[PDB]
């Protein structure tokens, strides 16, 4: 479940998503939102977006809801930055790997 195409598109989405989310979606009263990786399926139909977010357990959960609420806005801004015709479905995941 990782062709070279999928890895390359994921690096572009990582960069584009971090910009979109931090400069246009995020409440200024919360810290930066770090995207550590974007992992796509080979047909690019799904993207798992791994995240580092700052705060307590409820600030983490408040942040996930804001991003889910903004999914239409985020796919649209992403689609306007990439020749890709149909956007993947975006799934926001906490990055367990990091303590």
UniProtKB/Swiss-Prot annotation:
Principal subcellular localization: cytoplasm
GO CC field: cytosol
SUPFAM superfamilies: Ribosome-binding factor A, RbfA (SSF89919)
UniProt-recorded Gene Ontology molecular function terms: ribosomal small subunit binding
PROSITE patterns the record matches: RBFA (PS01319)
GO biological process: maturation of SSU-rRNA; ribosome biogenesis
Nucleotide-binding found in the keyword field: no
Pfam family, one: RBFA
Alphabetically ordered keywords of this record: Cytoplasm, Ribosome biogenesis
UniProt cross-references to InterPro entries, sorted A to Z: KH_dom-like_a/b, RbfA, RbfA_dom_sf, Ribosome-bd_factorA_CS
Subcellular compartments: Cytoplasm
Subunit (UniProt): Monomer. Binds 30S ribosomal subunits, but not 50S ribosomal subunits or 70S ribosomes.
Entry function: One of several proteins that assist in the late maturation steps of the functional core of the 30S ribosomal subunit. Associates with free 30S ribosomal subunits (but not with 30S subunits that are part of 70S ribosomes or polysomes). Required for efficient processing of 16S rRNA. May interact with the 5'-terminal helix region of 16S rRNA.
Family: Belongs to the RbfA family.
Protein name: Ribosome-binding factor A
Species of origin: Staphylococcus aureus (strain NCTC 8325 / PS 47)
Species lineage: Bacteria, Bacillati, Bacillota, Bacilli, Bacillales
């Amino acid at each position: 479940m990782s062709s070279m195409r999928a890895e390359r598109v994921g690096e572009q989405m990582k960069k584009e998503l971090m910009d979109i989310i931090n400069n246009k979606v995020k409440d200024p009263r919360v810290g930066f939102i770090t995207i550590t990786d974007v992992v796509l399926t080979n047909d690019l139909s799904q993207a798992k977006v791994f995240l580092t977010v700052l705060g307590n357990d409820k600030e983490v959960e408040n942040t996930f809801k804001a991003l889910d609420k903004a999914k239409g806005f985020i796919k649209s801004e992403l689609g306007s930055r990439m020749r890709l015709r149909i956007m993947p479905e975006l799934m926001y995941e906490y990055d367990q790997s990091i303590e």
